[PDB]
Design a protein around this ligand. Sequence first.
Ligand SMILES: O=C(O)CCCCN(CCc1ccccc1OCc1ccc(CCc2ccccc2)cc1)Cc1ccc(C(=O)O)cc1
Length: 182
Amino acid sequence: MYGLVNKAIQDMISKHHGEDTWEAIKQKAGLEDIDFFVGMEAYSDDVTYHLVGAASEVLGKPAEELLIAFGEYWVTYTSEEGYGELLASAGDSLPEFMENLDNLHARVGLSFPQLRPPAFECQHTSSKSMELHYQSTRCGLAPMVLGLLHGLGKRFQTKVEVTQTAFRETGEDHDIFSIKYE
Ligand SMILES: O=C(O)CCCCN(CCc1ccccc1OCc1ccc(CCc2ccccc2)cc1)Cc1ccc(C(=O)O)cc1
């Protein structure tokens, strides 16, 4: 993924657990060679996976737990590192934000040609609920989506419940979430 993702992981871990832990996690992933991540440079996804994998081992938490937390961090981090207005441009509510997400990524992609954005499809079951279909070129990031959604709830001062109803790992086509929200 683009380096901003890896920069955000670094930032999250460094801030919550200190530099020495991050330096240890960086070493285990086998990325001691990389002196800093370049935010607008495309990396192999394995770099992200290896950082999550190594942080799971070093912190003694599951990777998925870390994905949830990172998903929550991402929404705040990007608002502060040059993406606040773009985020604002996608709306003042969770359902609106999700409807706008495919277009928000179209904007990013002009800038960044190797972007592999996920596809989202909303189906509004009420004015307080929706089912969300999540489709991706990447495997195992559903837990991050769960965090992202909870990041958005926090951003819009909204109570959000998210449950995954279908997983790519029970054989299903794509991930599907059920969402209820204030
Ligand atoms: O892949 C999967 O399954 C999904 C993994 C989730 C990754 N994630 C989900 C976005 C998202 C989802 C839900 C809610 C809020 C969200 O945040 C909105 C938002 C804000 C800011 C930016 C700046 C991007 C940028 C990238 C590079 C340079 C500058 C700017 C992007 C998006 C974004 C992402 C997608 C593809 C790539 C890539 O392909 O690398 C890298 C990152």
